[PDB]
Amino acid sequence: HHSHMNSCILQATVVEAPQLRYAQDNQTPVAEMVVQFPGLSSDAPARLKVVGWGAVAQELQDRCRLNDEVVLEGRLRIKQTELTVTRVHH
Template identity: 40%
Template sequence: MNHCMLEVLVKKAPTVRFTQDNKTPLAEIEAEFDSLRADDPPSSIKVIGWGKLAEELQNKVQVNSKLVIEGRLRMNSVTRQDGTKEKQAEFTLSRIHPLSTNIALSSIPSKTQSNQKNNSATSSNNESVKWDSSPLIPDTDDIPF
């Protein structure tokens, strides 16, 4: 199974385009995440959101926003201008969890009161977004592990 979770910093504002066939929104951001070693520079990755997640990226996510993202990792072969091939990672979103206080994703439920029959004043801090299953990407990812 291919499921990844990354803590990222948004480096470029979201760009949105639409598919030709059914006009499904597709948003793309460039995000940066820390490397495992302290002396290595941060890595960048292209993050893709489809449908409602694309709309949320466009409307709510800004440059320098901190997010925890969940989804699938895919490796694409891209031909450079000099004719050589390069592998680039692409992350397809399933869920977004904001870490910055400047993000208020509408699809994230507000804090809910626990059992009101007990008159308990505790609330749940577990905020998450429903899974977005569109579109499905084939399980033929070429990840070099």
């Protein structure tokens, strides 16, 4: 559990297909992909690295394909920025 509020919910398009690997413990699945979402003005769109661990990692690899529009819920992490996903709506 985390002590601080860090709720980031984004509607985005999958632009780099999810790749899966097992973490150091050779037991926890970890999936990473890249998504793109609109700038606040038309601002170039933004691209963000998205990472999921465990069950959500398997769901990302299983469901997310290039050009799919999804909603992601996760915590912002940061120098490289990334969204550590908790849930995804396909």
